[PDB]
């Protein structure tokens, strides 16, 4: 049959052939490059960790993972940051275990 472009439903609104471009150079901000990855991993080695990072790390050596999230969350603030923080701390701890055997 014939189907008219309607203003309500799933595929609503005025049909137009859309041109897709590159995004602007503003959209790429907060992307890790090799040179600035280097600097963070150097000053990790110089400094170390915060007394709340070490406490959440020695929670994850004993494998109280839910309590590690709950602790990192009540310290840092919200869920998504505490999720990303634990996912990083566990990868630091797994790299230590890669150094444990060799």
């Amino acid at each position: 049959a014939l189907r008219y472009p309607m203003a309500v439903g799933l595929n609503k609104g005025h049909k137009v052939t859309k041109n897709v471009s590159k995004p602007r150079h503003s959209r790429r901000r907060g992307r890790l490059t090799k040179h600035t990855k280097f600097v963070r991993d150097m000053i990790r080695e110089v400094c170390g960790f915060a007394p709340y990072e070490r406490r959440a790390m020695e929670l994850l050596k004993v494998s109280k993972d839910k309590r590690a999230l709950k602790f990192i969350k009540k310290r840092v603030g919200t869920h998504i940051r505490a999720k990303r923080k634990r996912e990083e701390l566990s990868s630091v701890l797994a790299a230590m275990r890669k150094a444990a055997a060799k």
Partner: protein, 178 residues
């Protein structure tokens, strides 16, 4: 106070015998004085109106950028930088990138190599063919001293020494039970 090894590592300074040999080598590859520059511009006109030498790379930014680039043969650091955050990391950089480094006493002494007051860091980027051997016998005795002791340096807390009359009270209490 219980001083951390990143700060404390600047109190393990290069010995007097080596530091004299180092400043004797450093004294030949000076940057030109601001009055030395003009007599080089006197020597322009003989082709114009009618091939650049090795110096010490001065400052922290323009030594840091040629430690990361594999362009430093030996990096000299002053032990007494006024805010220490400027220089704390260059031990780590030079070790990781495989640059031999030494720590000297006196940024005033290291700034008298250049023609200013103070200069925190001073690097050897290149030297000449006849002065290769002096740089070679320096890097030997410096790289065995600093870069290879680095797992030792990193775990070494300075300070935590009580006053002499608090120590002398402890020693009296110690021989009072013997």
């Amino acid at each position: 106070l219980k001083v951390p090894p990143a700060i404390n590592q600047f109190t393990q300074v290069l010995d007097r015998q080596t530091a004299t040999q180092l400043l004797k080598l450093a004294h030949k590859y000076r940057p030109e004085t601001k009055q030395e520059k003009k007599q080089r511009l006197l020597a322009r006109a003989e082709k114009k109106a009618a091939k650049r030498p090795p110096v010490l790379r001065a400052g922290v930014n323009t030594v840091t950028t040629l430690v990361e680039n594999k362009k430093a043969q030996l990096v000299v650091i002053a032990h007494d930088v006024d805010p220490i955050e400027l220089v704390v990391f260059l031990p780590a950089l030079c070790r990781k990138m495989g640059v031999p480094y030494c720590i000297l006493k006196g940024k005033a002494r290291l700034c008298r190599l250049v023609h200013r007051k103070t200069c925190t860091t001073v690097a050897f980027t290149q030297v000449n063919s006849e002065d290769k051997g002096a740089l070679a016998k320096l890097v030997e005795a410096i790289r065995t001293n600093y870069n290879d002791r680095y797992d030792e340096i990193r775990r070494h807390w300075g300070g935590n020494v009580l006053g002499p009359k608090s120590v002398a009270r402890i020693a009296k209490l110690e021989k009072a039970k013997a």
